[PDB]
Design an enzyme around this catalytic site. Structure first.
Site, PDB file in Angstrom:
ATOM      1  NE  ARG A  37      -4.019  -1.826   2.230  1.00  0.00           N
ATOM      2  CZ  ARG A  37      -3.935  -2.931   2.962  1.00  0.00           C
ATOM      3  NH1 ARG A  37      -2.924  -3.077   3.806  1.00  0.00           N
ATOM      4  NH2 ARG A  37      -4.856  -3.890   2.838  1.00  0.00           N
ATOM      5  CE1 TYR A  61      -2.008  -1.797  -4.686  1.00  0.00           C
ATOM      6  CE2 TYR A  61      -3.329  -1.010  -6.544  1.00  0.00           C
ATOM      7  CZ  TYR A  61      -3.052  -1.020  -5.188  1.00  0.00           C
ATOM      8  OH  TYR A  61      -3.832  -0.234  -4.366  1.00  0.00           O
ATOM      9  CE1 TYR A  66      -6.561  -0.881  -6.759  1.00  0.00           C
ATOM     10  CE2 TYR A  66      -6.255  -2.868  -8.061  1.00  0.00           C
ATOM     11  CZ  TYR A  66      -6.369  -2.246  -6.836  1.00  0.00           C
ATOM     12  OH  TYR A  66      -6.268  -2.963  -5.660  1.00  0.00           O
TER      13      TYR A  66
END
Ligand SMILES: [Fe+3]
Ligand SMILES: [Mg+2]
Ligand SMILES: [Mg+2]
EC number: 4.2.1.84
Lengths: 212, 197
Positions: free
Chosen positions: A56, A76, A72
């Site tokens: 995170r 990551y 999104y």
């Protein structure tokens, strides 16, 4: 970290791109999209190279404009790659060689994090609490809209977890704390400029103090 | 000049990450393929739907679900990654619950499925905490003035599901019939279960 990722309450965005029960397509919309989560779990569970909290935080560390224009799942990919480089498992040069081009990463951390707080209170359901008026440059699981605001405990978790501000930096002093469902009146958080009723934030014990 | 950084195609970057790790023996055989399968096939809002239908027809289970969501879910074997500590939140004639993760995308994966693109959007993440009534309205769900909207922001390890109200016109329906009208969006809290005309 008061980063652009802390979006709750930001004004100027348009419609949510959905209407209820609309077709959302397959779980993954491209052949690579399962990789970020899969490789995160490899990193956490197989390699033991980092925590979920560190993932995170590394995403929060994306350069702000970079964050805002990046889909999104790609955030990551960038985050997990950054962690792998930071932990000395991979080099940026081998990633760029394999990718056939630039693979910019998240920015270095500007905070070493902080330990689990030494002095906290066990709160009970019904008790009034204030979110500590503190500023944390590293990882924190307190969205800014609730900083310094007062709410009521609706739940104390029956389990405890490492303090994110520590484990999100891979520190050895994260300890363990329960979290609390703290219910805030919408007007406590946004004054007259809200159409809602209440907001419940799930806050680590170390973010809280008795209300005055 | 606020310009984007130069970047190789995202597919090339993602596969490069895979190959760099896999080439070092750091990824077990079939590892990412196995997760892909789990994400696509096991983690599913059909599970949340099953739980709701059971709650709707079994007062004892409904009470367990609302007091120890984790235990209730465990009975079905539906605990998993991003769904180890479960709290179910009960809609009432005067309360509508809605779930978000304003800081990223946190979602009870095993029983709701991986979050949809829209749930992860900056639009949803920014707006629903502040103007949930307008957001639900725009999404096609009208919540009356006499109803409190409560937004749960998934900021820690609690993983939420909404237990919606059982709609009138479903009296005597089987668990399978009830499951069918509990959708992913009902579990997130943006939709209310619909009974056909
Ligand atoms: Fe999240
Ligand atoms: Mg801010
Ligand atoms: Mg270079």
């Amino acid at each position: 970290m008061d980063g652009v990722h802390d979006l709750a309450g930001v004004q100027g965005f348009g419609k949510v791109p959905h209407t209820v029960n609309a077709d959302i397509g397959p779980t993954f919309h491209a052949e690579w999209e399962h990789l970020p989560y899969s490789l995160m779990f490899a990193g956490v569970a197989e390699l033991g190279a980092f925590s979920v909290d560190e993932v995170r935080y590394v995403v929060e560390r994306m350069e702000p404009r970079h964050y805002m224009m990046t889909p999104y799942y790609e955030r990551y990919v960038i985050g997990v790659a950054t962690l792998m480089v930071e932990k000395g498992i991979l080099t940026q040069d081998e990633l760029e060689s394999l990718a056939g081009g630039p693979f910019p990463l998240s920015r270095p951390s500007e905070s070493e994090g902080r330990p689990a707080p030494v002095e906290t209170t066990t709160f009970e359901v019904g008790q009034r609490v204030r979110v500590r008026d503190e500023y944390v440059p590293g990882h924190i699981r307190m969205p800014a809209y609730c900083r310094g605001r007062v709410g009521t405990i609706s739940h104390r978790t029956t389990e405890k977890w490492p303090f994110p501000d520590a484990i999100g930096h891979g520190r050895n002093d994260a300890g363990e704390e329960p979290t609390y469902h703290v219910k805030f009146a919408a007007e406590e958080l946004f004054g007259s400029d809200t159409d809602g009723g209440s907001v419940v934030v799930d806050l680590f014990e170390g973010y809280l103090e008795p209300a005055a | 000049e606020n310009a984007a950084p130069a970047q190789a195609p995202v597919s090339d970057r993602a596969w490069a990450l895979f190959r760099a790790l896999d080439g070092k023996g750091l990824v077990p055989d079939g590892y990412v393929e196995g997760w892909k399968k789990t994400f696509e096939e096991d983690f599913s809002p059909r599970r949340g739907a099953e739980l709701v239908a059971r709650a709707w027809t079994d007062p004892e289970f409904r009470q367990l679900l609302l007091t120890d969501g984790t235990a209730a879910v465990a009975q079905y074997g539906y605990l998993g990654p991003q769904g180890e500590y479960i709290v179910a939140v009960e809609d009432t004639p005067t309360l509508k619950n809605v779930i978000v993760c304003s800081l990223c995308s946190c979602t009870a994966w095993p029983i709701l499925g991986l979050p949809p693109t829209w749930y992860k959007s900056f639009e949803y993440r920014a707006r629903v905490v502040r103007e949930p009534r307008k957001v639900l309205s725009e999404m096609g769900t009208e919540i009356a003035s006499d109803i409190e909207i409560r937004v749960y922001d998934t900021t820690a390890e609690t993983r939420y599901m909404v237990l919606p109200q059982r709609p009138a016109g479903t009296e005597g329906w089987s668990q399978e019939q009830l499951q069918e009208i509990v959708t992913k969006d009902c579990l997130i809290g943006v939709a209310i279960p619909q009974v056909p005309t």
